[PDB]
Amino acid sequence: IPSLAEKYKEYFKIGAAVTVKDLEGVHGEILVKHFNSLTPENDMKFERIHPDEHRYNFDAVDKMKEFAIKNNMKMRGHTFVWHNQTPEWVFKDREGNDVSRELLIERLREHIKTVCDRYRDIVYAWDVVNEAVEDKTEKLLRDSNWRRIIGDDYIKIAFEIAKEYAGEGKLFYNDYNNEMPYKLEKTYKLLKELIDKETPIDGIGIQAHWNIWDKNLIDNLKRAIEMYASLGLEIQITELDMSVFEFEDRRTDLLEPAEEMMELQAKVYEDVFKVFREYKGVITSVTFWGISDKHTWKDNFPVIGRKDWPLLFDVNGKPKEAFFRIVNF
């Protein structure tokens, strides 16, 4: 039972996404021992931390910050600008009309300044913009309220605002599947354009919502690291997990992993963490999207109500085989 974060202290931070209840019981003990970074899974989404025009909700995030300071951890900020996570008041003036460009920018500035002021002492990295890149088609960017109202500059402006208030925290673009052929080159092009216009972006977040069946994962991972690194960016793995299901595999029948799933999972985790260690000079943080299989978003996404087993600790809070293979170095 080595401490994962301790074993990786000369490589990068080891993080986990958390809710307030993850700070209690067995999960809290695992956090204390194995992790030196926390990401609020939901409680820093715009609609959670800032649900009304005149009301913020800091309660959950304050408890995670208190926890992090007591237990020698730092936090990742998640997230400022993320499709479908901004409450509707932000975009509307009293008549229900779209706000002006100038006003939307100012509301974003006030949001980011408020959140950064409160937490910049504990946050070392911010997911400033999340999943702006278009996923379904060949286009670069998604349609959104921000883009409709501000225009394409909303990304750069969000980074410029976060730059004013984040102190020493680093600023990230965060996305899923940004290692895959259909998305990597587009995303590289976007980031190159932002960087050339002097957007203060420090790195890219590779969400790494992966699965044990993906043949091209290792080669995709290396190529993405190479492309993003070549722009001068730092790389953080931000929401790593390892589904036993291909994404289009919506079967609901499994009551436990089928034979070979757990060993395959351990083998893949071993391989990705060897790549992480291999490109350690540019990867600065590795965060899992959960602590143990008892509590994972993969049980309800993409399929409501079916069990998955994607993390390093099993349903009993105990370390699975994957854990032992990634501390084996």
Side-chain angles (χ1 to χ4, degrees), residues 247-300:
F247 186 77
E248 59 193 14
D249 180 1
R250 307 294 172 88
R251 57 188 311 172
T252 60
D253 55 315
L254 279 61
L255 263 4
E256 74 179 313
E259 162 63 340
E260 100 146 337
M261 277 184 170
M262 280 310 99
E263 164 92 44
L264 219 210
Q265 169 176 74
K267 195 25 194 178
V268 169
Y269 261 137
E270 173 174 318
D271 289 355
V272 303
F273 264 87
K274 185 80 172 312
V275 172
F276 296 163
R277 284 198 308 283
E278 188 163 306
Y279 292 80
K280 164 258 277 212
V282 78
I283 293 167
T284 57
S285 188
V286 175
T287 288
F288 292 89
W289 213 244
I291 299 164
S292 80
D293 293 348
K294 177 97 159 280
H295 183 217
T296 166
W297 79 302
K298 295 294 295 146
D299 289 344
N300 289 308

Side-chain angles (χ1 to χ4, degrees), residues 71-276:
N71 297 312
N72 284 292
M73 299 168 302
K74 279 150 195 154
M75 278 185 27
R76 301 189 77 257
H78 169 80
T79 335
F80 293 141
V81 177
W82 181 14
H83 65 83
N84 306 93
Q85 301 304 330
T86 305
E88 195 33 79
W89 69 261
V90 175
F91 304 115
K92 294 329 196 250
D93 68 20
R94 80 304 303 259
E95 322 279 324
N97 300 324
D98 285 351
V99 285
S100 76
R101 170 179 215 270
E102 302 58 26
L103 174 50
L104 218 212
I105 289 172
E106 169 64 21
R107 285 187 179 169
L108 182 60
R109 183 198 73 80
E110 294 174 12
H111 179 89
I112 297 192
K113 181 188 152 50
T114 299
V115 173
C116 283
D117 285 348
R118 194 168 191 90
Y119 300 110
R120 70 166 76 103
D121 64 307
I122 201 51
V123 172
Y124 64 99
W126 298 90
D127 291 342
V128 175
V129 178
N130 189 50
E131 305 174 12
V133 167
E134 164 69 25
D135 195 74
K136 286 204 261 280
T137 74
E138 91 285 345
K139 306 289 178 65
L140 223 218
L141 294 179
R142 298 167 186 247
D143 208 90
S144 70
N145 287 313
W146 308 96
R147 187 194 201 175
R148 185 172 77 257
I149 288 164
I150 290 156
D152 289 4
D153 265 350
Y154 86 84
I155 300 170
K156 174 173 175 190
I157 289 166
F159 278 97
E160 283 171 325
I161 296 173
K163 175 67 149 188
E164 302 182 17
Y165 302 113
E168 293 313 83
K170 303 268 189 87
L171 306 179
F172 284 78
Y173 177 70
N174 194 51
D175 215 334
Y176 67 89
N177 293 355
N178 41 358
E179 82 284 1
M180 299 191 36
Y182 78 99
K183 208 168 182 169
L184 166 58
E185 216 267 327
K186 277 205 316 210
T187 298
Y188 167 94
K189 276 186 188 312
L190 201 219
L191 295 170
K192 175 148 184 294
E193 286 181 341
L194 298 170
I195 289 159
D196 289 354
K197 308 175 180 189
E198 306 162 343
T199 306
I201 167 163
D202 301 300
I204 183 169
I206 296 173
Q207 278 182 28
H209 289 294
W210 292 333
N211 69 88
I212 58 176
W213 304 114
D214 177 4
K215 297 199 89 41
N216 307 325
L217 168 62
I218 293 305
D219 177 83
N220 282 352
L221 181 55
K222 305 172 159 192
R223 187 185 260 105
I225 294 167
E226 287 155 33
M227 284 209 200
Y228 297 135
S230 70
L231 293 174
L233 289 162
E234 151 179 347
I235 311 227
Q236 290 186 341
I237 304 292
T238 56
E239 328 188 349
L240 174 61
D241 47 21
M242 191 59 63
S243 173
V244 305
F245 306 109
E246 295 185 290
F247 186 77
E248 59 193 14
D249 180 1
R250 307 294 172 88
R251 57 188 311 172
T252 60
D253 55 315
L254 279 61
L255 263 4
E256 74 179 313
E259 162 63 340
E260 100 146 337
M261 277 184 170
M262 280 310 99
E263 164 92 44
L264 219 210
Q265 169 176 74
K267 195 25 194 178
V268 169
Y269 261 137
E270 173 174 318
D271 289 355
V272 303
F273 264 87
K274 185 80 172 312
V275 172
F276 296 163

